[PDB]
Assembly symmetry: C2
């Protein structure tokens, strides 16, 4: 046997950044944002729910122990993978390497977008054409997309959880909620610890988490959707 | 009022025989199936399997047409057929046992046994193989099987050095030619495309999800998720 290339490949819409177009497709969903087309599978949802039970075969108990706050805490809730991707994108927009070559006006726009992705589930954010008309240039759009791909790429530098002191996670605080992204065998576990405000006003610690399949990000980390 | 992104190690982790490899049995489990072979426990997901069928039947949106065209020998071929990831893993593992780096780490008494296992995994779909005690020229220790497992882990590890299909001339496939049978393993975004071509010219293909092998790609044990 030997390595060989047989199936190798042969060698605008600015307002798309303000849209979050989710739509069901074969094997899951498609989400369009910017010039990215995300293909989200239904993978792991059944497993994730089952792992919150303590009546799992012994091989899964280590997993439940490692993520106690997620699996051995009944109060934590599982979110759909496309919501977890949305959260992941919100984090990417705040990447230090991305916001370093942006103009301040557009930087503040990116900030609004980031908050919209992290805190909301709405399909659109409305920003005044006055700010977009001077700050959202083709260059800034290009850089923004290049930055997100770059963040996806550095996520693949993460090692899957291991027993030999290797960085398996990325932690960040954004708009009053601790976000943790961990690489597992199935992809990236996206975990958010926030404070929920329930209407007398009552504040409580809340934990949500979802699983973004590796293929979702690998498609946009370096082609074809397969 | 917020912090910055930081790499974190917060989630750090703190007897074989002939009969253990002589079976290929699919066990029902949550989210798919479990296959036990040697000291390997394969978790095969029941997902990513519907997409291949749609791509074959052309029940897809137009964004997948370049994918159907790139793999025209798989999705645009009347004499192509899809096997479940359970059988695609079987083929893949069969090829693994034929790895040269694994072969040179064995002994002819054990090499002949491994070869029999390989042909059984590659050419058959039977759940068990019975090798007559006569054929065993030597005793088989647990250690010989252990280093065989290491060889398999190493083959998985080499498959992860493949790049996804690209346009930079980077290797994205492992080919192996046998007796009237060609086997190609291609790394896509969703995992590894395993196809087998025979003669007339028929082809059979399936998909092995990246998680199946990722779990067993490193020397360290780790955790199933």
């Amino acid at each position: 046997a030997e390595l060989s290339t047989r199936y190798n490949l042969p060698a605008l819409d600015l307002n798309s950044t303000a849209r979050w177009i989710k739509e069901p497709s074969v094997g899951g969903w498609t989400v369009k944002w910017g010039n990215f087309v995300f293909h989200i599978p239904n993978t792991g949802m059944t497993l994730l729910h089952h792992l919150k039970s303590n009546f799992v075969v012994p091989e899964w108990q280590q997993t439940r122990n490692l993520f106690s706050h997620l699996f051995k805490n009944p109060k934590s809730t599982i979110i759909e993978p496309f919501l977890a991707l949305r959260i992941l994108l919100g984090v990417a927009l705040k990447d230090q390497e991305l916001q370093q070559s942006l103009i301040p006006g557009f930087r503040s726009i990116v900030h609004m977008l980031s908050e919209w992705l992290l805190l909301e589930v709405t399909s659109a954010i409305h920003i005044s054409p006055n700010l977009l008309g001077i700050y959202l240039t083709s260059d800034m759009f290009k850089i923004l997309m290049a930055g997100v791909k770059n963040f996806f790429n550095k996520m693949f530098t993460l090692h899957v959880v291991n027993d030999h002191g290797k960085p398996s996670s990325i932690e960040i605080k954004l708009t009053g909620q601790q976000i943790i992204i961990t690489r597992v065998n199935m992809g990236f576990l996206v975990e958010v610890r926030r404070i929920d405000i329930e209407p007398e006003t009552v504040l409580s610690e809340s934990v949500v988490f979802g699983l973004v399949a590796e293929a979702v990000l690998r498609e946009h980390s370096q082609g074809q959707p397969l």
